[PDB]
Structure 1
Amino acid sequence: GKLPPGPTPYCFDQLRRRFGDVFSLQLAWTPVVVLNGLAAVREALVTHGEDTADRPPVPITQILGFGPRSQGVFLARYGPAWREQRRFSVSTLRNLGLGKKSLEQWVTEEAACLCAAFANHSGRPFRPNGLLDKAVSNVIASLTCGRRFEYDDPRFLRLLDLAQEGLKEESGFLREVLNAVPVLLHIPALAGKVLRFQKAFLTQLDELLTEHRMTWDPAQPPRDLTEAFLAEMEKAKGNPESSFNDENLRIVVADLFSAGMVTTSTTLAWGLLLMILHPDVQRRVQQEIDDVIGQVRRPEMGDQAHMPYTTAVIHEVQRFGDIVPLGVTHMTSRDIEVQGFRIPKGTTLITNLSSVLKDEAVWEKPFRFHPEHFLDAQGHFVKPEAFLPFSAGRRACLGEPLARMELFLFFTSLLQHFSFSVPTGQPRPSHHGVFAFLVSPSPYELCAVPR
């Protein structure tokens, strides 16, 4: 077949309008094919999902204790080691969610802590990012370790700080070079420099896991994902094929922790920024909150079905926010065909999710914050096919149900008790974000006055 034509997200918008939705690039040793628009993305992740659910090899993960039966979930290669952890994490989230609503309970209570932390900043401008990280991180810790940490807890702060630094290391030029040739890691001085912040994050997490293993009561049903993991580890003793082992427990937990902490928080950070840039939208949400919930009762997930406008605003925050523009890289495990063109096995796939969320042929005004993107004339919530912030296919975000819950409950609770605005005397904050593998809003302050 014909190979795709050939010559950051702004650079891909030029290449798309010069070579089409499926073009190619040659980044050093790696052959890369970029996918643009819903059609091209769907064709790879859904139609040929069986052949595009693999990850590109990351040899430097061996420093972090990555093995064949211990690859975590996020970077895990397509196969049994991934499928077992994928199916486990998805099912455990569901099981902890249903029954007694443990998920909803921990989030609701964490929201109240977030509202209280905001209240102590009242009558004074501040950056909401730090508090959002802690509140979002605690929800994860409630699912993994079955606990939360105080906002001034020393180890908690260090855990969050190391996690934020570990994200920057992922986007380092030193990475790709060492990732290409693994024998460079044999250098003792060089090996410690590669992922010093990430390995620090692991070490700090180990200390917390060890403590948790002490308090775990096997005689009772697992309170959290780690306890559920530990319970499987005992059953998998004497089985070298199982991905349930000590080396993988610290990696899977680190995956779930890091993933749903920098994403959900950044989204909420975008959310509050769009609420002070567009106060009219904020008022309509707060009005719908009063008409459906009130101003004293805590928001519930059962309220979402009766709050179409708020649902549209949150969805539009994700769409406009566009926090993961280029998604997470895939890799072809076979030879496939995308939009007529041929894609060789082992080709690194890039899913330009930004081109889907900002598709001008789909959305009425893609480059604007327009809540009506998810509303019809009547006021009903509609969700277009092109809403893919969690990507699609087998590798689609397993944290989406939790994210949906965290976003609705945190966003509604904050607007229920606070009115957000720009601090007078300060410039109107740009709605353009600082580009990375994860797009955060441009640094801003806000005033949160109670109601």
Structure 2
Amino acid sequence: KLPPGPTPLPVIGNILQIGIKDISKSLTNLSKVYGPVFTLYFGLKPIVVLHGYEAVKEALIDLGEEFSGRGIFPLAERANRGFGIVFSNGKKWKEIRRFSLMTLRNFGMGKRSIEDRVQEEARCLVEELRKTKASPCDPTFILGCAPCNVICSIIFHKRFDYKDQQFLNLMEKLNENIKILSSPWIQICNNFSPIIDYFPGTHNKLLKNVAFMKSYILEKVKEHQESMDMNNPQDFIDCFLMKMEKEKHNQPSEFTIESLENTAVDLFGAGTETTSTTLRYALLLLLKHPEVTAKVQEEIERVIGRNRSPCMQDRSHMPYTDAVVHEVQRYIDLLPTSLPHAVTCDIKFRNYLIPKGTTILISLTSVLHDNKEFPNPEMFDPHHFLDEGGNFKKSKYFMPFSAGKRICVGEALAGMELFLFLTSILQNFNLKSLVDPKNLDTTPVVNGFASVPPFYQLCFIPI
């Protein structure tokens, strides 16, 4: 059989029992009734929900391959999103993923490392923060530019100037699509309808935005072709063309110009917003707990001092910082239900039959907020990642990037941006709150499957 669930209604399945507002709260409530594995219907569509470390680890990790499909909804084809990495399945995905993992290796693309692209961005970021002359600031935009720029430098081999028009509207489009894609109407409700697209105009703005981005990418591709150096690949495009001019005899190939721009658009989509929000929420949390910021600053001072840029080598020497960054990710739980999975064939799971192509919802929340692994899991507290001797304490339960065969492609990259951007910020600034710390609220604003910090302002005071 399928795993037990609330018994559906005919046709609207379980829809009107789900708290649409905070899905992860609802999934957790359900697990109190039906335990760690359970089924929900979203309009005939069966969705098995995994809750808790044990359930998640066995699916994602022990049954890795079987749990490796991307769950597909109406929106997947309504915004043409199954032709890059994030929303691909089968051979197309295996190939572009394995390729993309190779290229995004630290030395994956020539003599400039990923570290060096990030280090550069950290200096520019510190610079822009100086330019605000310690005056009150919504860091939203500035923090957003840094991750967007890292993506640009990884793909086109250039960073941009933060005022370069080509950069601003590239971010605008991305920012537009992101905000749209986070509407519950779009993310959810328009998915209760298999056939009729109920937001034509919206899907249109979505795709028009993609086209702008896709066309800009093509310009850079034509430029990369004319200036090709086979022995000197320098970014993601160079690598991709070389994989092409090499698959030329395996026609037709998973690697085409079209799969390139789609992969690029994927990386811009997956690479900016979540990193950007993670930084924005890190600063919020740092303001709220200035003792925490104080300790990071001690670590920076003692390990890196005020001369050079920080660098990834430093992290092994800065367990307290490391614990902070982890604890930020853990606490804010930005993707409460990851992205959706599908099984790749039919399988028995503990005690059930799950049919090839059935949608799987992983509850990351249940893992990040395990109250035995992380006592008081709703308090922000970097001690969740420290031993009683104050060394870094790894946790199997650290899954803000998911786990298994679909684990975030930017795990190592995001981990480097957060460390370098955070340590550079605090090396060069103290953070002044407007309101008093005691009043400021840091609890996540949840909208469906989306988690976001409260609006806030602060000042970046030089040292």
TM-score when normalising by structure 1: 0.92
CA contact (8 A) 1:145 1:209 kept: no
1:235 aligns with 2:246: yes
Alignment map for 1:104-123 (pairs within 5 Å): 104-123=115-134
Q: Secondary structure at the match of 2:47?
A: strand
User: Which piece of structure 1 moves more, 308-317 or 196-205?
Assistant: 196-205
1:199 paired to 2:217: no
Q: Distance in 1 between the 2:102 and 2:340 partners?
A: 24
- Structure 2: how far apart are the matches of 1:212 and 1:27? 41
For 1:103-142, what per-residue CA distance to the aligned partner results, in whole angstroms no more than 9, with x for missing partners? 1111111101111111122331111111111011111111
Give the drift of 1:159.
1.6
Question: CA–CA distance in 2 between the matches of 1:95 and 1:448?
Answer: 31
Query: Which residue of 2 is the match for residue 45 of structure 1?
Result: 60
Q: Which moved more, 1:174-183 or 1:17-26?
A: 174-183
1:10 paired to 2:25: yes
Residues in 2 aligned to 1:35 and 1:399: alpha-carbon distance in whole angstroms: 24
Contact persistence 1:422–1:428 (CA under 8 A): no
Q: Following TM superposition, by how much is the alpha carbon of 1:4 offset from its aligned partner in structure 2, in angstroms?
A: 2.5
Determine the structure 2 residue equivalent to 1:55.
Answer: 70
- Alignment check: 8 A CA contact 2:109 2:236 kept: no
Using a 3 Å threshold, how does the CA distance of structure 1 residues 310 and 251 change in structure 2: closer, same or farther? Answer: same
> Which residue identity lines up with residue 115 of structure 1 in the other structure?
V
Aligned to 1:25, what secondary structure does the other structure show?
Answer: strand
Partner of 1:401: 412
Aligned-CA RMSD value: 2.4
Q: Distance in 2 between matches of 1:239 and 1:2?
A: 41
Q: How far apart, in 1, do the equivalents of 2:120 and 2:407 lie? A: 28
More helix by share: 1
Greater Cα offset, 355-364 or 212-221? 212-221
Provide TM-score, normalisation by structure 2.
Answer: 0.89
Q: Deviations over 1:318-367 (max 9, x none)?
A: 00111111100001122223453432332210011011101112112211
CA contact (8 A) 1:96 1:224 kept: no
* CA 184–89 in structure 1, closer or farther in 2 if over 3 Å, else same: same
Q: Secondary structure at the match of 1:311?
A: helix
Alignment of structure 1 residues 291-306 onto 2, 5 Å? 291-306=302-317
Matched residues, number: 444
Hey, what does 2:44 align to over in structure 1?
A: 29
DSSP 3-state at the match of 2:92: helix
Matching of residue 170 in structure 1 with residue 185 in structure 2: no
* Partner amino acid, structure 2, of 1:151: Y
- C-alpha separation between the residues in 2 aligned to 1:74 and 1:167? 15
Matches of 2:346 and 2:139, distance apart in 1? 47
| 2:460 aligns with one of 424, 448, 451 | 448
Per the alignment, in what secondary structure is the counterpart of residue 345 of structure 2? coil
1:417 is displaced (CA, Å) by 0.6
Structure 2: unaligned runs, 5 residues or longer: 8-22
Report the alpha carbon displacement of residue 409 of structure 1 after superposing the two structures with TM.
Answer: 0.5
Is 1:20 matched with 2:20?
Answer: no
2:31 and 2:38 in contact (8 A); partners too: yes
* AA of the residue aligned to 2:399: L
Structure 1 unaligned residues grouped into runs of 5+: none
Moved more, 385-394 or 51-60: 51-60
The CA deviation at 1:174 is: 5.0
The answer for the alignment partner of 1:253 in structure 2 is 264
Secondary structure of 1:235's counterpart equals: coil
Cα–Cα, structure 1 residues 171 and 136, in superposed 2: closer, same or farther, change >3 Å?
A: closer
Evaluate the alpha carbon distance shift between residue 218 and residue 180 of structure 1 in structure 2; reply closer, same or farther with a 3 A threshold. farther
> Residues 2 and 39 of structure 2 are in contact (CA less than 8 Å); yes or no, is this contact kept in structure 1?
no
CA distance in 1 between partners of 2:189 and 2:423 (Å): 45
Alignment correspondent of 1:219: 229
Identity %: 40
Deviates more, 1:97-106 or 1:49-58: 97-106
- How far apart, in 1, do the equivalents of 2:267 and 2:173 lie? 15
Offset of residue 235 of structure 1: 2.7
Amino acid at match of 2:329: Q
> Which amino acid in the other structure matches residue 87 of structure 2?
L
2:371 counterpart of 1:356:
no
